[PDB]
Write a protein that binds this DNA or RNA. Structure first.
Length: 132
DNA sequence: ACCGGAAGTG
DNA sequence: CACTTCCGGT
């Protein structure tokens, strides 16, 4: 059962102004518990009003933190960690490397790649998601 | 910027 | 476990 299948259970599978993949729902789906960093990044990447500071690149699930500081600010906010910065947030991303959640794109600045089979998990292909 | 150990929070 | 905080090194 994908996430796309999961959201059908909601009264509003996609609320008007809200993102397509809220981290809370995704946490509820995965059953992880509190919001995780890789889930928060998807929420922003599925939010049109966040395109400016974070956005998908061309191929697959590669994304770029255009403005790392604004991402780290919203991450601190969501986590109630006032002193959050990219230096610490990115250290959270490096812990995903050996866990195969996210990987660093070698050579590109602030560019990362989801590597946890998002096609199967979300139910959306890269192209289908990147339409919205 | 990016890395990954160490240790602390919860 | 999942970071958060800090660090010397690349």
């Amino acid at each position: 059962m994908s996430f796309k299948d999961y959201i059908q259970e909601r009264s509003d599978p996609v609320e008007q102004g809200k993102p397509v993949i809220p981290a809370a729902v995704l946490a509820g789906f995965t059953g992880s518990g509190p919001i995780q960093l890789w889930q928060f990044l998807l929420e922003l990447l599925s939010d049109k009003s966040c395109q400016s500071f974070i956005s998908w690149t061309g191929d697959g699930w590669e994304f770029k933190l255009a403005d790392p500081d604004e991402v780290a600010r919203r991450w601190g906010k969501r986590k109630n960690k006032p002193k959050m910065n990219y230096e610490k947030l990115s250290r959270g991303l490096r812990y995903y490397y050996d866990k195969n959640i996210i990987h660093k794109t070698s050579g590109k600045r602030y560019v990362y790649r989801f590597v946890c089979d998002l096609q199967n998990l979300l139910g959306f292909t890269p192209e289908e998601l990147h339409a919205i």
